Amino acid sequence: GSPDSYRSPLASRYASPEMCFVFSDRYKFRTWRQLWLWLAEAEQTLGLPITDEQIREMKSNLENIDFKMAAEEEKRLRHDVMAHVHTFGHCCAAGIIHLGATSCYVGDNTDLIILRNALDLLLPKLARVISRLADFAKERASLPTLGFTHFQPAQLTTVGKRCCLWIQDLCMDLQNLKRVRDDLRFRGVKGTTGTQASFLQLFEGDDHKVEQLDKMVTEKAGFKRAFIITGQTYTRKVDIEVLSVLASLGASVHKICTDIRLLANLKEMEEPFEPYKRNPMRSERCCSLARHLMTLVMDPLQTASVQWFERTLDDSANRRICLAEAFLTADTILNTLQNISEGLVVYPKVIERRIRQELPFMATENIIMAMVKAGGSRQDCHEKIRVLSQQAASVVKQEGGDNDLIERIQVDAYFSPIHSQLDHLLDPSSFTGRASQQVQRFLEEEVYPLLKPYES
Amino acid sequence: DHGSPDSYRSPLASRYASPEMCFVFSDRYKFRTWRQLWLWLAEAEQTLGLPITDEQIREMKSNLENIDFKMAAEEEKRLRHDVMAHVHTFGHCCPKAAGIIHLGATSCYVGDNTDLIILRNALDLLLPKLARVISRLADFAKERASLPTLGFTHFQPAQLTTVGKRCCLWIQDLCMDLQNLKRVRDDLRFRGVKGTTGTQASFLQLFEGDDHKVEQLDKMVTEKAGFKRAFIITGQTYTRKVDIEVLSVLASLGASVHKICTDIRLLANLKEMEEPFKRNPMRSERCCSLARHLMTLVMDPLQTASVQWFERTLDDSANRRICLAEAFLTADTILNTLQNISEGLVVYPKVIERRIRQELPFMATENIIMAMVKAGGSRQDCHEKIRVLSQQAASVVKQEGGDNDLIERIQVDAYFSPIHSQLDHLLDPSSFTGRASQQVQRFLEEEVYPLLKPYES
Amino acid sequence: GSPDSYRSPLASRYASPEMCFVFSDRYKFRTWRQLWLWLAEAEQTLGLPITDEQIREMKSNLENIDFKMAAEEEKRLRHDVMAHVHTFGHCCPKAAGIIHLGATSCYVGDNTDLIILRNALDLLLPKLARVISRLADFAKERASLPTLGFTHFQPAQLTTVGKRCCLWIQDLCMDLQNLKRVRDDLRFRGVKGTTGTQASFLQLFEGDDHKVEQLDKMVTEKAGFKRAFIITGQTYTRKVDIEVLSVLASLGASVHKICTDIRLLANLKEMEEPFNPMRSERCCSLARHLMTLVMDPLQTASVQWFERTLDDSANRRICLAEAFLTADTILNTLQNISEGLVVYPKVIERRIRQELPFMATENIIMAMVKAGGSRQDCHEKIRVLSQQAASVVKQEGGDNDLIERIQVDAYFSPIHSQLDHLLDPSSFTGRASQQVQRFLEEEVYPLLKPY
């Protein structure tokens, strides 16, 4: 709000409103009231003294939270969970709110619901990007381009084939995100140290009633599975599995955008339009943010390593930051990446220019093989070809002119039984190998199947 | 081998890790596998109609272990190439196969596929080790399932848990590691034959435009390698995302192990539990030190994957020769040392009982107020009456450094008339542990044993 | 702040209003205007057609910022700096033609970051010194009070409370020195142009090489810096950010160490936080994040291509502010902790008493030899009385009774009864109290002098 105070650039400038809502106070305190409703619903079903009038008024007061009252009662009573019990019970039921449960019933189950929801926003966005990159890869599947190893010219590839290297990495990320989201489990009702003591007390020693309660709220929260063993909170290892797959996504994006930045210099490919000089500013923002995601991994790792026994509260402040800032960063990244993918501009003639410069240095083997087939001796042909290439290399390096190796093998009499066959031995398409067929097979076997559920 | 004391010894090779994992990352295994990959290539190429004879095949199959490391290093100096040097040395012990070795292949066919074979082997040696650790902790967790111990939140006295339940926190964290390790081993895919830029250009020229034969070759060497699946899309090498996926689980494992051993170290101070053999928990401190390094190593493959330009840059080669090996050798040492810890953790039941009885009356107060309504007495007048006696009892403990005298105060107090006779039953340690004992039994049978079953051998 | 939107907890819950302001858009764009004024003033002196009316106009409108207009212009122009040049030129109609004259974007953007970095360090420095000041008082007060030393977190030769506090102080002192050096050696970017060659300023002064050097000197002195970079690309070297976040990350490691000890002492009931050690848990949590952040500028500086790549911007806008707001929060909480550390001597005594006999056995032997005793016929006589006591402590879970077993054996009769002068807790503390004395007088107080 105020420009007098520091404002998170991930919150006020970079990320989408959708992701910002999930990590807001309004959504957190709404979920708190939502978890209290489910607790009361399941407790009434199991025989605890709860009247239907207490339930209906909690149901009609889910999105009616007084912040001015809650903020000052938190300053008055120190504890934040109990401060929200008072505020809910004021617009309500008061006697049955949070009965038996501890602070971490709302706080910790909210985090897993927030976590599951945030992953649910990233998935269709990642698929959307992949889909748009897939169309680009299919369109440019046969357009030959100079391949790079050590960032030096190497055996030709296609523009579509190069794109599939990016697509694959994102397809592993989609799969990883989906797995982690599906594997996410509910804490349930566990108590102060995970022994379920206070809940067992209310049900007066009934062990089956506690287990039924643990299955009831888990299904109301939309989780398939619920933890058996926990300390106070869910194991902090969960936060590692989630941030690992995001950091991996960060690495992928960084590689993709660095490729695009290098292609922008070669003037072979640029970012979509709204001038001669164009900076790839969106890819650079992406690289910047991806880096943050890779850094973020050390936070949950260090945390879980130093949790003592059932729970130490030195996870609280660190998780408030790293978890939201992981998803806000990933969110910005995917919005930007989606923007970049919508009509990447390719300049074919610039690509054709770079090929015809380096191509003759790679086609030398084809020439000799064509001399042998006619009747020329390999040994003698190798010595007479490894001499015109050193001349043509000198012109390029020492003098800074265009490549003229093809001309020199047209003005040499020794290479007379090849002059008619030269413009076929230099067809760029006959140097791309199985590149176009690799795209074909990859998109149908691996890419399209994964995109199928996300068709919308 | 244990080299001269004049040179630096890497402690992960001799000082710590098991000779098995050391061998998987050795030059012998590396170059035996190189020659194996050349044998599978020749066999499959002979199947596809290339001029290779049975005699040439038997020659390669016989000389697989016959490696001259001295000559290969000397030829590497001259030829300025590691692979083409080993092609020459293999051709020297195989004079008839010399012509067909590495036909159509590029450097990474042997270089990069060997690292995939190394990864899968290295994971398959870690799994049984991680499972034996889980098993012995599951033995321990069953024995001590109903042994009350003071629970710690904020490392401060809280409601009672059991020793078995505390062990299950450790068990679960290692159980998710087992699942993650398995999943990564199964997801590993063979690179196969791809050529210098992944376009299979060289092999397509060998079969002379025959696209079907090239894809046939790729499947053939993959099956011979024992891989269910191979990549369709690579540059020169398999995507360096695979390193991230592997080392992310080892780093995560390290975080769980570091937690387990920090917990054990703290218990050793409390005298509640100690390691097998004034004693120092050196082996838990050894585990912590190494787990830390295992967590640190994750930033390497992360950064490596982020700066790989196009189809490949060699700015990953040296880094991978360090991070991958060390991660597994570190991961190896940890689980060998952790296995020795889990085999016989010593519990001191009487020391645990002492700490419980000096903290229990402060959390048994609620049961008293509920118990006092049998007569009965008022809820609010009793809440303040027992509250102030705790203020006097906690003052002798902290401000004067003594023992808990709260029980002594209530027994002589005239106000607490009826409750006297049922106090020992009210302070029953088992009636504070909740469902801890039932949580232990269910966790082991529902989740632990089904996971450990495939490792009966 | 809005409840419907996410808010960075460091700005709305944790850090001080002082630190939050140094990283605000108000401070940022005011400094932009502050740097444009200096440039104009120096350009006038060097002979450019700028009137005092124009400078007077600029000096009057440093704080008069229209953010609404500045945001609308950036959407249109797709440029941060030019938008603010236009907005400043709107409330300064006469100076509009001379704002940002011959300058590049990074003259404001990059020099502002350096100004912000220096200012933020200048707020952390007094706060750190003040923490060290009160921890020094605590170290002097409890300098002689013996406490059980811990190696491997196991009872070892007893030290003193003040001595253990000095281990904390020494780490923080090193931080204070490292924060001072980084702030003092921090340099100004100055005027460098788009690629660091000063080509555009050279053209404005129509070739006059000396005038470009003077303009660089003048804006540096006006900014309050002692030194400027001679060599830069577009921006100051990103190595600078590494050095700053390195000292802060190291400070995080120190803070986490101090707060872990406090968290362990609270468990042992030997020391307490002023009120669960929740303040030390908040400190540990944030210190952890401060250590994480060092990897950002490291990766950022490693992949800077040539004269500059813009893949540093968004990351720095996150990692720099977050580091300082975190650091600020930590020190604030550490101040509160240091104001009210409560020691409980009696609990310390009790723990000492049940471990002192296990560490005093060597002095008993040394007092038995010259009293007429054998070196093995006494060592065995006491070591058996240590085996039975180790069972009472560990197998039975009771009190340590080696302080009881003296009358039991008639062998130790010459020892009756000059003790417990031999079991004096102060006689096992070594040079702990002298070491505290020297440390404060030679190393700590000289550092806290000019604060």
Added chain:
Amino acid sequence: GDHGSPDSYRSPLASRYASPEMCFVFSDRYKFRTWRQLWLWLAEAEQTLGLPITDIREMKSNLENIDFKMAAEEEKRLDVMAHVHTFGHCCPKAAGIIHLGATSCYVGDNTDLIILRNALDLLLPKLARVISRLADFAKERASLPTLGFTHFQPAQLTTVGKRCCLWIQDLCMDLQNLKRVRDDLRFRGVKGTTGTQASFLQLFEGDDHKVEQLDKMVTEKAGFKRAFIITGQTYTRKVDIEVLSVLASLGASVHKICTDIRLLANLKEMEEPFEPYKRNPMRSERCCSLARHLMTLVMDPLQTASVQWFERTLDDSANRRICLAEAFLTADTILNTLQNISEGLVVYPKVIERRIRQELPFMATENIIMAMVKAGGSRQDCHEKIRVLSQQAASVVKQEGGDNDLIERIQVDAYFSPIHSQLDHLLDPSSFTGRASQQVQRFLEEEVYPLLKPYE
């Protein structure tokens, strides 16, 4: 070459990569030798203070003679006492005055500090040598115009010498950091089990002054100017942080330089030294790989010091043996390879000139309009004419993949007749370099040469 069988894992940092000097610094031979040298200094200093010690010569002559089997046997039977016994066998005359009243960390921890300082002393001259070589190159190419790069897009011309200065300045800040950390490195001395000097206070019979004189004497004998007053068992693990922080900062600088060389290699502007036609910057690639590891190693000591409980805990021992040794072996290798790259950088002036002429015309438009106004032309007419001709040239480059013909278009247009004679001056590369050459001379004389003078 060193020894090791191919049947076990041999760390490439020791056997394959680093130079023999650094390997010896972290070897067992140097570790145990320094132990005995520290034991000697202890006896000699205790002799000067009054303790019953006589001619010292025996320990002096038996420093090189170490039996590793005897030490390993006693290590299996009982490491410090295993070496007290081994050094107390081949020295029969003196065995009751070795390690007298000292703890396991007098040798083990002070050795760790003599190694660190030895390792830094090998690095310093090596880093100075690289700066010196690069500086020579920078002076030689200080007035050689090259294309400036921002966003890796064409920008205001700089010089080759100037770009080199950006690298030098990074390394110069590294040399400063290393000198400061090495000089401010303190000795642990004598402290005892928990750092109170109790064991020594007993054997000097309560003498305060004598304990403090022993601290100064072994500090002076070790080559240190200063000793710690306050330490626990070992020196504060903050020391590891500061050492590896600056090393991590060096790896970042090296990565930047070597990424630059690699990119220049693709532009064919600059190349690694000889000993064609395709050449790979494999040496710069090795450096980036190794520098990356060096940047990673920083979290090790960071995590270590943060979880040190009280006086000392030995969960640092295994981590420090790895991380410290690795960092200095990696730093050493990097600087050895970076010495190679510096030694005979190949520059291709004509390739550099070709790139400039392709990008300069677009940047030179301001000067052309200035020259046209200077002759009697209109500002608007010239700006519109130069606008239509620049967009025509941009199409030829982008859409057609041809050379930059902007100057040709100006040269054939009759409107530009007033400046046709001026064109070979208006587009002089040197006039676009700004003050680059002057910055090089000033930087080298005021910062580099003073900094290198002590290292001469």
